[PDB]
Amino acid sequence: SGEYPTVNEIPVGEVRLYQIADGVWSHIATQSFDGAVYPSNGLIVRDGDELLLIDTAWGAKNTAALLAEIEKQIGLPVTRAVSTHFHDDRVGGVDVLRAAGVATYASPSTRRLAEAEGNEIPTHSLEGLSSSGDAVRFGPVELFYPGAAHSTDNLVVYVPSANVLYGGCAVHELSSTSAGNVADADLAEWPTSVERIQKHYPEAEVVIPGHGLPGGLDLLQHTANVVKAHKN
Ligand SMILES: COc1cc(-c2c(C(=O)O)[nH]c3c([C@H](C)N4C[C@]5(C[C@@H](CN)C5)OC4=O)cccc23)ccn1
Ligand SMILES: [Zn+2]
Ligand SMILES: [Zn+2]
Hints:
The PDB classes it as antimicrobial protein. Keywords: Complex, metallo-beta-lactamase, inhibitor, zinc, indole carboxylate, antimicrobial protein. The assembly is monomeric. Crystal structure of the metallo-beta-lactamase VIM1 with 3270. The protein: Beta-lactamase VIM-1. The chain has 232 residues and is α/β, with parallel strands linked by helices. The chain has a single domain (7-231), classed as Ribonuclease Z/Hydroxyacylglutathione hydrolase-like (Metallo-beta-lactamase, Chain A, 4-Layer Sandwich), CATH 3.60.15. The protein is 25% helix and 28% strand. The protein has helices at 60-73, 88-91, 94-99, 108-117, 190-200, 218-231; strands at 15-21, 24-33, 36-47, 50-54, 78-82, 103-106, 124-125, 135-138, 141-144, 156-159, 164-168, 206-209. The strands form two sheets. Strands 1-2-3-4-5-6-7 form a seven-stranded mixed β-sheet. The chain has a five-stranded mixed β-sheet with strand order 8-9-10-11-12, covered by helices on one side. Helix 5 packs antiparallel against helix 6. The longest helix has 14 residues, at 60-73. It is globular, with a radius of gyration of 16 Å. It starts with 14 loop residues before the first strand and ends with a helix. The structure holds ligand YJZ and zinc ion (2 copies). One zinc ion binds next to loops.
């Protein structure tokens, strides 16, 4: 009923959308992994009379449910999707998208990592993102590679029309004391990568983490703090 939807409020398999700003929504779904249930976010950005999707809903059936929820709530076609790193919460569902006519994109680094690890593989390579600080335009967003953080390939997404910063899994929510799933992370470089984000997007109004509640710019400093303390 209007609050940001939370893990115990979303059964696995259902998807909810949340309006962030004009022409910007997040998508929220839940999935089981290693015997625990987690929420995860993605983004939807209006691209004229089409939609740009950022990240899958973490699995094939969740991603099919995402497409149905978009058709119900928004009713514009998803034409392109970008995955912001190689993990299943970002690419699991790419096969569903591709069979639904959506053109799927990721950096070459993400594509290689997904292929190596047996995750679903976006079709199209996003060049111009291989050096930290790189940025490219993609429809109504800017894609930015901040450096290694949660993963070596993680991208962030900025919506300039709305000053919305989608940090993906490189950014954690304010209630997190913990740095989430660090299996593929670079804890040493992560604060430097966050500082690059902070420098590049000083006018961000909304910051969306890969998992959990959106907030403001404080999510960035909080993330750096939690990562440093984890390493400590
Ligand atoms: C309190 O626990 C958490 C956990 C997370 C969390 C995050 C995140 O932090 O982005 N990602 C998760 C994943 C994803 C799919 N995978 C799995 C994997 C690849 C490795 C293979 N050996 C392990 O690594 C990774 O990230 C699964 C389960 C939970 C999370 C967020 C917040 N709180
Ligand atoms: Zn991840
Ligand atoms: Zn994640």
